[PDB]
């Protein structure tokens, strides 16, 4: 909620969140995790060590180097793992769900959960399920995971055109230019390094961007250390703008991506509709389907749903941060829940929660936040059709 927390972007910890539905349809990112790569930590260390050898550190830089060496030991063998904070985030999400809708999960209700093959997502599922079971051990629970779910949870790895775009598409030079524009490395490096102006701009920006990366992830690790004060608030604001743009262009509805990053999510939207239709019809008798995956899953899924603002197509890179904010969409433990209700005339209504807050769709309803399922399904089906059309052009 603080400005500083928000500027961690997709690395922001899940925010504070302190009738009765007949079905809940869920997608959740894993909870708060350790950094996935040592790359940024190694860069910062190499720069500071080289400086130490040539007598190039300030007192603050020597202290920073000491801290970086410490984090290197603490991160060792922990890369990419769910942290204790990440487990508690899932416990909180499950706990509020059970507390809000006890009748749904009462008696011998049936639930199913799936996860990707990635350990932090499986462990997030388990933190969530363990909370459900503790509250009602009489639940019937199906738990599965792995590469069999790649088509719906890891579609971003399976589409060749998208993989090419993500790795070398036209968004890259836009992002790099924006970084050069927003981030001035010299004043930051002045804190840690003697003669910071002697550094070339490329190496200077790589160092600063790496240091921001280390600082941004630290609150997700449950390690009792903090580096927010390495940078001023304006510096964090600028860094956030650059990473926000990176996420928007590489994973969401940026014009430069031509909706390719969004279109690839259609199989998951299809599966969401299918699981709901089966419960409504009686073919399935689950009270909930839970799914645990990644920000690479959640971001395009939310845009494809067309939750208001998340699918905006903004042409000016400088304007993106005004209209589209990654920390509002995909913080750590980011989740989408569709809650289904039957009224006293047996009409079916759906409420959409994004990070446990009611979300709007660009269709009408006389009882917001509840939408007609019939209207909603028709709208989502049109989104899927649009997605298939988009992909028909980028087959490569």
State the method: X-ray
- CB-CB contact of 57 with 193 (8 Å): yes
Q: Give the containing element (helix H, strand E) for 372.
A: strand 370-372
Nearest residue to 207 via CA among 3, 5, 51, 33: 51
Burial of residue 119, with CB atoms counted within 10 A of its CB: 0-12 exposed, 13-18 middle, 19 or more buried: middle
Name the DSSP letter for residue 306. T
Report the first-to-last Cα separation within the chain, whole angstroms: 43
Q: Give the containing element (helix H, strand E) for 168.
A: helix 160-168
Three-state DSSP class for residue 324: coil
Tokens of 303: 């845009």
Three-state DSSP class for residue 385: helix
Name the DSSP letter for residue 256. G
- CB-CB contact of 379 with 361 (8 Å): yes
CA-to-CA distance for 59 and 186, rounded, in angstroms? 17
Tokens 């009489």 locate to: 138
Listed by start position, the domains of the chain span 1-396
State the DSSP string of 103-150.
Answer: TTT-TT-EEEEEE-SSHHHHHHHHHHHHHHHHH-TT-EEEEEESGGGH
CA-to-CA distance for 82 and 76, rounded, in angstroms? 14
- CB-CB contact of 132 with 94 (8 Å): yes
Q: Please list the alpha-helical segments (H only) found in the chain.
A: 3-6, 39-53, 59-75, 84-100, 119-135, 150-153, 160-168, 171-182, 185-190, 201-217, 233-251, 260-263, 266-281, 295-305, 320-323, 326-329, 373-393
Widest CA span of the chain, in angstroms? 79
CA-to-CA distance for 389 and 396, rounded, in angstroms? 14
**Chain Cα centroid distance, residue 383:** 21
- CB-CB contact of 14 with 92 (8 Å): yes
Strands 140-145 and 348-354: unpaired
Tokens of 278: 């089966």
CA-to-CA distance for 254 and 273, rounded, in angstroms? 26
- CB-CB contact of 130 with 164 (8 Å): no
- Please tell me the number of Cα atoms within 13 Å of 282 on its side-chain side: 0
CA-to-CA distance for 68 and 42, rounded, in angstroms? 9
Tokens of 140: 């019937």
Resolution in Å, one decimal place: 1.7
User: CATH top-level class for 1-396?
Assistant: alpha beta
Three-state DSSP class for residue 282: coil
Three-state DSSP class for residue 355: coil
């Amino acid at each position: 909620q603080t400005k500083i927390q928000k500027y961690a972007g997709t690395a922001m910890p899940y925010p504070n969140r302190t009738m009765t539905p007949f079905y809940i349809n869920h997608l959740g990112r894993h909870g708060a995790r350790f950094p996935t790569s040592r790359k940024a930590l190694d860069k910062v260390e190499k720069v500071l060590v080289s400086a130490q050898q040539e007598n190039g550190l300030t007192s603050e830089g020597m202290a920073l180097l000491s801290m970086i060496r410490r984090l290197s030991r603490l991160f060792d063998g922990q890369w990419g793992k769910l942290s204790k904070l990440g487990e508690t985030e899932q416990e909180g999400i499950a706990g509020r769900m059970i507390r809000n809708y006890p009748q749904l999960f009462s008696n011998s209700a049936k639930i199913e959960a799936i996860a990707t093959y990635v350990p932090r997502s499986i462990n997030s599922m388990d933190a969530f399920l363990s909370c459900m079971i503790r509250h009602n051990p009489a639940l019937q629970v199906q738990r599965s995971e792995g590469k069999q779910y790649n088509h719906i949870l890891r579609f971003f790895d399976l589409n060749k055109s998208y993989v090419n775009y993500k790795e070398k598409g036209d968004w890259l030079p836009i992002y790099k230019a924006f970084v050069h524009k927003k981030i001035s490395p010299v004043p930051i490096m002045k804190k840690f390094l003697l003669n910071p102006e002697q550094y070339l701009d490329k190496e200077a920006e790589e160092f600063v961007m790496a240091l921001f990366s280390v600082a941004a992830i630290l609150p997700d690790t449950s390690i009792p250390l903090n580096l927010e004060d390495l940078f001023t608030l304006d510096e964090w604001h600028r860094y956030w703008q650059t990473q926000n743009l990176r996420q928007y262009m590489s994973k969401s509805s940026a014009p430069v991506g031509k909706m390719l990053p969004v279109a690839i999510a259609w199989p998951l939207l299809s599966e969401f509709i299918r699981s709901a239709q089966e419960v409504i019809s009686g073919k399935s008798d689950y009270q909930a389907n839970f799914r645990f995956a990644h920000d690479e899953t959640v971001i395009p899924f939310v845009s494809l749903m067309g939750i208001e603002k998340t699918d905006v197509q903004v042409c000016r890179p400088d304007s993106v941060s005004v209209y589209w904010k990654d920390y509002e969409i995909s913080p750590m433990a980011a989740n989408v829940q569709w809650l289904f209700y039957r009224d006293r005339d047996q009409r079916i209504w759906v409420k959409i929660l994004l990070n446990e807050e009611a979300a709007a769709l660009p269709i009408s309803t006389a009882c917001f936040p509840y939408y007609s399922w019939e209207k909603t399904r028709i709208f989502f089906n049109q989104r899927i059709e649009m997605a298939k059309k988009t992909l028909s052009v980028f087959n490569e």
